[PDB]
Amino acid sequence: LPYDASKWEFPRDRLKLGKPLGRGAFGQVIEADAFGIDKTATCRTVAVKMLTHSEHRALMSELKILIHIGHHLNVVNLLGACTKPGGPLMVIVEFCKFGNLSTYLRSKRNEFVPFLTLEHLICYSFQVAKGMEFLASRKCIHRDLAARNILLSEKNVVKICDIYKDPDYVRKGDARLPLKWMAPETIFDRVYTIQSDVWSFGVLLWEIFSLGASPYPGVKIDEEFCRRLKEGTRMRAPDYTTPEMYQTMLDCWHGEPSQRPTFSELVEHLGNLLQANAQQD
């Protein structure tokens, strides 16, 4: 796709290198301080993804996809890039200072009461639905929608984002089993659609209302698990759910993709639950 450098290109000399945020198999991310990236005279912390032709192509692909998606409050947003010859290829996105939502909710289990409250949990759910409705409108499918892939920014705003680590330092929580988020049709027939994202969203809801527990507690994820899933077996309600939120999970887990709610429908419904939650008398 084309690249409008006027719109996106940011000077490398206006990025002050900061702390490493992670290296994966392909691409390392660092914090940086960017002067003037939003055209005002401010220094802003940002996250920078930086680097074979295959690797170059993949990072350039991410840049182009982000430009295509465009801007929404609840999707990690592209701020700029450094592509011109003479320095590394860099993709600059919004920094989310509080990390992923799964780990965060886990850390708050002794700081929750109906502190986190149902208002927070329903709000996070609503925001993710809003981000997914947006992505669906751009004809995108996420394919691994899970609380680990939702980052937490200031003022409780959550943002959707999209095997390598030294085993000496691996801790419980550092990995998850993506199979546990996959729709039956994605498991059995590698079918990914916006409606399989809705199934995943149901799992993400369960994560939120379990305050960051792993799905299908104690269940072995094998051919038997998969069989029971197709037949209709579902997770039980998590410990901090409301009845309405568990009903929504069940709806998202409809066995027929076309009978699951759409993200627009989930936005309307969750917005209603959220509004009802904070009403008077």
Ligand SMILES: COc1ccc(-c2oc3ncnc(N)c3c2-c2ccc(NC(=O)Nc3cc(C(F)(F)F)ccc3F)cc2)cc1
């Ligand atoms: C080892 O690999 C990694 C290490 C650290 C991080 C990271 O850490 C962070 N800490 C704080 N804020 C951030 N934005 C990040 C980020 C960070 C870096 C990049 C991105 N990029 C995207 O989300 N891209 C993206 C997003 C989508 C979307 F989900 F929005 F649809 C689709 C395709 C995409 F390529 C999002 C978050 C990402 C990968």
